[PDB]
Design a binder for this molecule. Structure first.
Ligand SMILES: [Cl-]
Ligand SMILES: [Cl-]
Ligand SMILES: [Cl-]
Ligand SMILES: [Cl-]
Ligand SMILES: [Cl-]
Ligand SMILES: [Cl-]
Ligand SMILES: [Cl-]
Ligand SMILES: [Cl-]
Ligand code: NI
Length: 579
């Protein structure tokens, strides 16, 4: 079934401003400080061009250049409410997007003459950084998540379509990060910020928020957002990146997020006041649920960042956030969803995704054919660039298959590259590696094909092979510490698999296939079609395995290994009562 298709670049960072006008027209508004404009599609999301908004559509009095205001349709009136990411006013439409707009006053009236700066002084100003207005309780209430970076998320609530407002009694919070190993310092503290909210079929609200932890945190409301439960970790991995929840016409829930694990903090990292560097925003993922979140499927990469391997990744526009974080979605038909995602004009995209692809149970790859589109292989030059970035290099390269043919295969080794080391930071990204996504499974079978490079190897040369539940950097040697299953291929004294205690030898100068068949807390490992050993689960997962990760283990420059094919098949383990 159709792979994700890039169709355009939105005129603002993703997360706000994407709105369906009618069955064929979809718009994405902008944060422009000049005359308002939007990107528009008149063929239900296929093709796009820029267009000026009419003079009755208000300028961005608040907000910022890189982000659109949020624009949300009131399901009862079919008019719209607009709020900014930060600052500005509350506008309500009369006659749709190209109709008359009115601004909400502090006393709960409507101002037609909002172009008058004096009259703008008695307009309602909702505080905090805001995300997306959401209509709940059969359209009778609208709530807007807002946060303070240190204080957490609460909700602006209106029961009269946006004329008058109050604040929730509480909201969502999440704990500070602790600099335990392998961290050498503290992650930027964000207290459950940038929430997305979904109304469940029974009326409960689910809030999912960005944190300093390894995963998003969540809380629930039984009173349409007045009060919220004690916050807890969610199942959606990711740190200092953003979540979006939505619902399709048939009731299926969609979760969009950046399913990554950042590199551990380095010795230069602070105490939570400010971040160091982002090493975790070069992907976006999708999962779906047909049973109000009791079970999930997919956890598929929508896209990898095209610039991820580039030594000039941050070189231009140093202060501006970039990558594939943030998203907003609009259903296009029964099977297809339009997603705006990412940050920075060179990185943000509009992508169409098919739910039947989300529900697929197999995937296969060959490094030489598929590196650019499907493989994460970047390492970082650990020298801070711009506000919070690192420039990159590919950590592995393609070489000729020594067997002959046209096949190109990926050489994964310990690099000799001083640019990948920072002694003061106390980090060393010279171990090359590679990681690849597949549909999530609590049970499955993954096979890969590898060969020892005919060259000098160090005493600890080899490959650590891990099944994981999010995308770990190619150069992250700590992946094995978070892995669901992990084991080393060791090259010295002679080549062998270490499967706990058991050494399983294999020949140099030849291709070998390894299989990993996992189910529950065990994986059976096979070598060239013969059972070789068993691995105990190293870490539990709320979801299952959706990545395989391969990283070199050598501590001195070496020749390493070659990686050819990978394939995966996972199974549905259906709900039943025999437990
Ligand atoms: Cl303002
Ligand atoms: Cl505004
Ligand atoms: Cl409020
Ligand atoms: Cl302790
Ligand atoms: Cl849930
Ligand atoms: Cl590339
Ligand atoms: Cl550079
Ligand atoms: Cl910034
Ligand atoms: Ni910053």
């Amino acid at each position: 079934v159709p792979e994700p298709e890039v169709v355009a670049t939105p005129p603002a960072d993703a997360g706000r401003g994407l709105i369906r006008v009618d069955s064929r027209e979809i718009r994405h508004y902008s944060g422009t400080r000049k005359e308002p404009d939007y990107l528009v599609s008149r063929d239900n999301g296929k093709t796009w061009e820029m267009k000026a908004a009419p003079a009755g559509y208000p300028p961005n009095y608040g907000g910022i250049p890189k982000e659109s205001p949020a624009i949300v349709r009131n399901p009862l009136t079919r008019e719209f409410i607009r709020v900014q990411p930060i600052g500005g006013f509350v506008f309500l439409s009369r006659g749709g997007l190209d109709g008359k707009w009115l601004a909400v006053t502090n006393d709960g009236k409507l101002e037609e003459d909002w172009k008058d700066p004096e009259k703008r002084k008695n307009l309602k100003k909702l505080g905090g950084i805001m995300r997306t207005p959401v209509f709940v309780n059969k359209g009778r209430r609208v709530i807007v998540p807002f946060h303070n970076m240190g204080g957490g998320t609460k909700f602006h609530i209106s029961d009269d379509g946006g004329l008058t407002w109050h604040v929730s009694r509480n909201g969502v919070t999440s704990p500070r990060h602790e600099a335990r190993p392998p961290h050498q310092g503290v992650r930027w503290f964000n207290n459950a910020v940038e929430a997305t909210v979904l109304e469940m079929k029974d009326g409960t609200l689910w809030a999912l928020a960005r944190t300093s932890q390894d995963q998003a945190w969540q809380a629930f409301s039984k009173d349409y957002g007045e009060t919220w439960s004690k916050p807890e970790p969610s199942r959606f991995f990711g740190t200092l990146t953003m979540n979006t929840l939505g619902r399709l016409d048939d009731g299926t829930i969609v979760s969009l997020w950046t399913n990554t694990m950042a590199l551990p903090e380095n010795a230069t990292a602070g105490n939570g006041t400010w971040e160091d560097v982002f090493t975790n925003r070069d992907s976006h993922h999708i999962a779906m649920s047909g049973d109000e979140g009791k079970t999930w499927y997919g956890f598929r990469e929508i896209i990898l960042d095209e610039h991820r391997n580039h030594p000039g990744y941050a070189t231009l526009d140093g202060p501006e956030d970039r990558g594939k974080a943030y998203s907003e979605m609009v259903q296009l038909d029964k099977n297809r969803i339009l997603i705006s995602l990412g940050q920075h004009k060179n990185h943000r995209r509009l992508v169409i995704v098919d739910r039947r692809w989300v529900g697929a149970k197999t995937r296969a790859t060959q490094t030489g054919k598929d590196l650019d589109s499907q493989w994460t292989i970047h390492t970082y030059i650990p020298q801070k660039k711009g506000h919070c970035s690192y420039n990159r290099k590919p950590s592995a390269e393609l070489v000729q298959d020594p067997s002959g043919g046209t096949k190109k295969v990926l050489q994964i080794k310990r690099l000799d590259d001083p640019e990948l080391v920072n002694e003061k930071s106390n980090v060393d990204y010279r171990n090359g590696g590679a990681t690849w996504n597949f549909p999530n499974g609590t049970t499955g079978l993954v096979k890969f094909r590898f060969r020892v490079v005919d060259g000098e190897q160090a005493d600890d040369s080899g490959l650590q092979v891990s099944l994981t539940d999010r995308l770990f950097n190619a150069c992250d040697s700590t992946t094995k510490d978070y892995a669901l299953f992990t084991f080393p291929i060791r090259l010295k004294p002679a080549p062998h698999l270490l499967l706990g205690m058991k050494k399983v030898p294999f020949t140099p100068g030849a291709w070998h296939e390894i299989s990993l068949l996992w189910q529950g807390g065990q994986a059976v490992v096979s070598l060239d079609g013969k059972k070789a050993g068993t691995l105990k689960m190293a870490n539990k997962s709320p979801n299952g395995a959706s990545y395989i990760h391969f990283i070199s283990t050598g501590s001195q420059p070496d020749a390493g290994i070659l990686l050819d094919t990978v394939n995966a098949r996972v199974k549905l383990e259906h709900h039943h009562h025999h437990h």
